[PDB]
Structures are given as structure tokens and as C-alpha cells.
């Protein structure tokens with residue numbers, strides 16, 4: 069019955085597949101078509117055609133493993149896409165049409181139906197599979213009767229009858245929010261359209277509207293740009309992705325139903341884009357510190373994941389108007405064009421998405437200007453993102469506190485992310501591939517960059533924890549200067565350290581004090597563990613003298629500096645130790661498999677060479693202090709360290725501060741309320757984090773109390789001398 073429901077489904081088909089936009093003469097589209105042709109060909113030649121078959125596909129035969137249901141139905145969706153693509157060799161193919169119909173019936177009779185109960189993961193039963201079934205039926209609605217459609221979607225209503233909750237049939241349902249809430253729309257709104265059920269459509273859309281509300285606690289988007297999911301996990305880059313990616317797909321359809329969403333309600337999406345997503349995108353890469361356990365997926369490295377966000381933004385731009393549309397187009401354009409490592413089209417999986425991107429890139433009317441400098445203090449999720457446009461580098465600071473979980477290990481994914489939030493830092497430079505090409509399965513998980521840890525063995529079976537202290541946070545002064553601290557205690561309460569960071573425009577100072585260890589394990593801070601490029605080798609200098617690193621760790625006592633020299637200055641990394649320090653370095657090939665950190669991944673061996681720099685802490689009360697200076701050549705680095713000779717103001721158990729004389733900026737962390745006199749110019753009076761700038765006789769102050777998550781009146785925390 070061709071009606072308004074089918075009309076909406078046609079629009080949905082144009083969004084999830086886009087066959088109406090296909091053009092064989094379009095190289096990028098032809099590439100995706102060829103991929104789908106191959107997938108269908110593989111599925112058709114391996115499917116079971118035997119009577120009394122115990123499965124459709126032998127590699128997805130054990131139906132007690134929920135993942136096999138979703139994978140099976142997704143193969144049918146691929147078939148539906150091609151059978152309805154005039155340019156496919158499978159267009160209106162009678163064998164494929166019958167294969168999809170027969171397969172749906174077979175699964176319905178022996179594997180997935182209303183009489184079944186969740187076996188394995190609820191996600192496959194309520195989201196993964198229902199979405200694959202909805203899309204298959206939507207694409208091939210001209211081959212199924214309304215009665216068959218309702219028949220094959222009854223199971224969806226059994227497992228997901230309530231648009232406000234998931235796991236309804238289990239003994240522990242949960243309130244649907246964020247990404248999950250968006251998926252609820254792709255499940256019940258589409259099923260509602262297929263079943264011509266107005267009540268399901270309306271109630272689901274109404275439920276979906278909750279997603280536009282910013283929160284001040286719990287899961288969701290925060291005013292400061294943070295995004296929390298799974299109770300207390302920083303998750304903008306994975307569940308946030310699903311949210312914007314899926315919602316941007318749904319909106320065009322929803323807005324054409326009898327229950328469109330108010331325009332002022334959808335206004336918050338622009339806040340997510342500018343405040344939440346944009347800062348986490350550097351040279352086409354979505355910062356891993358925001359991706360949770362997804363970092364352990366080989367097919368979802370940083371640049372790939374970024375496309376999920378970018379395509380979502382582009383769709384939103386397409387449904388926007390005027391300046392709003394123009395600026396969003398420019399944002400997507402400059403990000404994509406800044407990415408010289410990853411081909412955006414590799415993750416644009418529908419013809420409309422491919423088409424939109426091509427028009428954007430070729431439209432001279434859409435400005436593509438390098439993004440300006442910025443610094444986002446995502447205090448509500450304990451992460452900080454910094455980007456310097458003049459020099460061209462990004463910096464990510466990954467922390468956690470009593471308010472957030474350090475790392476997520478679940479569904480057998482991210483088994484070794486133990487220290488990824490223990491004050492771990494990321495540097496985004498000229499090597500756009502650094503955190504890609506197998507970084508995650510080859511990086512030594514015991515030496516994450518920036519972290520202070522003991523060398524005790526850790527179990528893959530462990531799960532995340534919150535930090536005992538709430539004294540973790542960032543005080544931002546402007547787009548280039550901020551200060552952060554973390555009152556760190558390790559996983560088993562055997563080591564402590566007051567770790568602080570001083571972001572000073574074109575460099576970051578790392579200070580650590582009060583380092584104590586009550587265990588028999590050795591303690592050390594990993595200054596860096598950088599993945600190398602065989603094509604661009606580094607020439608290493610210690611105290612400005614070339615050094616030859618080996619697989620075997622070499623000690624360098626009385627080190628004032630270390631410089632990693634590339635042929636490309638935008639890949640250079642220098643480390644200046646305020647006080648001569650005893651460090652050790654090594655360059656070695658590290659091997660591993662994605663399966664080591666994610667059970668469902670390939671056991672194929674991967675290898676990468678890493679340069680590791682560490683500083684041992686053999687005594688209680690130890691400390692570390694150094695300045696990370698990227699993107700400058702050797703002579704310039706040498707000149708800068710002389711300018712910074714006296715930049716360290718203090719680094720003890722109650723006070724840590726660094727001064728940038730060139731900028732007239734101070735970064736300060738106070739652990740108590742004593743009166744601290746700084747540079748004989750002013751005094752800071754309260755426990756907390758400060759970033760201060762002197763402009764003549766004037767003083768600009770940025771104070772933050774991380775525990776109460778509040779700033780304070782200037783006179784309460786600052787006092788100029790005389």
C-alpha cells in the first residue's frame with residue numbers, strides 16, 4: 069500500500085543506501101558499489117543451500133552468540149541494497165530476491181522470533197539485528213507484503229516495546245539516553261513506519277527528543293562540551309559518534325512525519341558540534357581519549373572514527389540553512405582537506421554521503437581555511453584538548469577522577485587500557501598516522517606516555533575504577549593557555565604523585581611531585597613512547613649530542629635535554645628538563661595482535677617501532693619536571709631552552725608553578741590554602757588551579773577549584789603585592 073509511510077521509507081532508503089543517486093561514471097560511488105557487489109557475491113557463494121541446514125553462514129552459525137544474528141541479518145541488508153540498485157549485477161535478481169525472502173523466513177522460524185529470549189548480548193537483540201531487519205524490509209518493501217513485514221517485525225516489538233528503555237525483557241532494564249536513544253529511533257521509528265503504527269512513531273520521536281537536553285549530571289552532553297556515557301565514562305568519540313551519526317540520518321525522515329521535532333529543540337545539536345566534537349578533531353583524527361574501548365578495534369582507528377562524526381555534521385549542514393549551513397560545510401571541508409593520511413571516502417558508506425562530500429569539496433563557494441587555535445577544558449569528563457594553529461600541533465590530556473572511570477574494558481574489548489587515563493598525554497603532529505597503523509596492539513600498555521606507574525603485572529580481566537580524589541581539573545585562561553592537575557593514586561593504592569600540566573601556547577610543561585611508593589615494585593614515569601615511521605627516521609640528541617638508541621635500554625644521567633630530529637620540523641619533539649634528570653631511552657620493535665587487546669579482533673601479528681623515554685623514581689618524595697616543545701628545529705629548540713632556563717617557579721608537595729616570561733603567563737597548582745608568593749609580584753591564596761597573565765600593571769586571572777567544580781571571586785584567591 070503506497071502511502072505516507074512508504075514515502076518516508078523511500079526517503080530512508082535514499083539515506084541508508086542512496087541507490088537513486090548512484091552514478092557509474094562517479095569513481096567514488098563505483099568503488100562503494102564494487103565493494104557491495106563483492107560482499108553479496110561472497111555471501112551468495114557461501115550461504116547454505118542444503119535442506120535442514122543448521123545455519124545460513126558457517127562462520128556465523130553458533131546462534132547462542134548474539135553477534136552471529138546481527139552479522140547474518142546485515143548480510144541480507146547488503147543483498148537488499150544491491151537487488152534495488154539498477155547498476156548492480158544483482159539488480160532484481162530472482163535468486164537474490166528469493167534468498168533474502170527465504171533467509172528472513174528461516175531465521176524467523178528457527179533463530180529470531182517473539183518466542184525467543186535474549187541469549188548473549190542484549191544489543192544484538194534490541195539494536196543491531198532490529199536495525200538490519202528494518203533496513204532490509206525498507207529497501208525491499210516492493211517484494212514483501214505488508215503482512216510479511218509486520219510478521220518479521222513482531223519480534224522487534226517483543227524485545228523493544230518501550231521507546232524509553234532497553235533490556236525491557238531482562239531482569240535489569242535501563243533508561244535509554246544518548247547514542248542508545250538515537251538507535252532506539254532507528255529501531256522503533258523505522259519499525260513504526262514499516263508497521264504503519266502512528267503511536268509507535270509518535271511515542272518514539274517524543275522519547276528521542278530527550279537527547280537535545282544538556283545535562284549537569286549523569287550521561288549526556290554537558291554545557292562545557294563533555295559527553296558522558298555508561299554512567300561515568302568520557303565517550304564523545306564512540307557513543308557520541310553513534311548519536312550524531314544516527315540522528316543525522318533519522319532527522320530528515322522524522323521531520324516529514326506528523327510528529328516533527330521543534331526547531332528550537334534541535335538547536336542544541338550545533339552546541340555539540342562546536343563545543344563537543346570539533347575540539348576532538350585534529351588533522352582528520354578523532355582523539356582516542358574520547359573513544360573509550362573502541363580504540364581496540366582495528367577497523368576503527370582515529371581517522372576512520374572521525375568520519376562517523378564528519379558525515380553526521382555534513383548531513384546536519386545539509387538540513388540547515390544560510391550561515392549555519394555555510395559554516396558547518398566549511399568546518400567539514402577544512403578538516404577533510406587537512407587530512408593527508410586518510411581518504412575520507414573510505415568511510416562514506418552510502419551514495420548520498422559520497423555525493424554530499426564531493427559537492428562540498430568542489431564548491432569554491434565553501435571556504436576552507438585552516439582552523440584557528442583553541443583549548444577546550446572538558447572538566448565534566450576530565451579531558452583537555454589543545455590545538456596550536458601557528459605551529460600545527462594538537463595536545464590531548466587524558467585524566468579521570470572520583471567523577472569518572474579511568475578506562476572501559478567490556479565485551480572483551482580494550483583489555484589493556486589500564487593506564488590510558490593516568491595522566492596520559494597525546495601529541496598530534498606532522499605524523500597523522502601515529503596513533504594508527506596498529507598503534508594500539510603494539511604500544512607497551514605498561515608505559516603509556518605521561519603516566520607514573522609501578523611495574524606490577526596487570527590482569528587483562530581487570531575493569532575500570534574511579535579515582536579516590538576529586539582534585540583533578542583544568543583552569544583555562546584563553547585559547548592558548550591552561551593549567552591542569554591530577555591528585556594521582558595508582559590502581560592498588562601503592563603509589564601517589566601530584567601530576568600537573570602547564571599548557572603555554574607552544575609547549576606543555578609536565579611537573580610531578582610527592583612521588584611515593586609503598587610497594588616492592590619499581591616506579592617510573594614514561595616521558596614518552598612514540599611510534600616511529602620507517603620512512604621518516606629520527607636523529608636523537610641528548611644534551612645536543614647525537615645519541616644512538618638500541619633495543620636495550622640505555623641510561624642517560626644528568627640529562628638537560630632530549631631532541632628528536634626529523635627531516636620535517638612539524639614532527640620534531642624536544643624535551644627540556646628544568647633540572648638535570650636521570651632518564652633511560654630505547655628504540656625497539658614491538659609486536660602484538662589486535663586480539664591481544666580485543667577478543668573479537670584478528671590474531672594476525674602486527675609490529676611497530678617505538679622510542680621510549682622513562683625516568684625512574686627510586687625514592688619517596690621524588691619528582692620530575694620537563695617541558696615538551698614540539699614542531700621547532702634543533703637550533704630553535706636550543707634557543708628556547710635557554711629562554712626557559714628559569715621557567716620553573718616551584719615543584720614540591722604543595723606548590724607547582726611554571727612561568728612563561730615571553731608571554732607573561734603563570735601556570736600554578738596549589739594543594740593547600742597557604743599564602744604563596746609568586747615571582748615577588750603577586751600572591752595566590754587557595755587550593756586549586758590557576759593560569760594568570762600580566763598585561764602591564766594588570767593581571768588576568770583564571771582560577772578553578774576542581775573538587776567543588778567552581779571558580780571564585782578574584783579577591784578570594786589572588787592578591788597583588790604592594
Ligand SMILES: CC(=O)N[C@@H]1[C@@H](O[C@@H]2OC(C(=O)O)=C[C@H](O)[C@H]2O)[C@@H](OS(=O)(=O)O)[C@@H](CO)O[C@H]1O
Nearest residue numbers: 189191192196247306307308310362365368376479
Ligand atoms: C559506541 C560503541 O562502542 N557501540 C558498540 C557497537 O559499536 C558501534 O557499532 C556501529 C553500528 O552501527 O553497528 C557503529 C559504530 O562505529 C560502533 O562503535 C557494537 O560493537 S561492535 O560490534 O562494533 O564491536 C555493539 C555490539 O554488541 O556494542 C556497542 O556497545
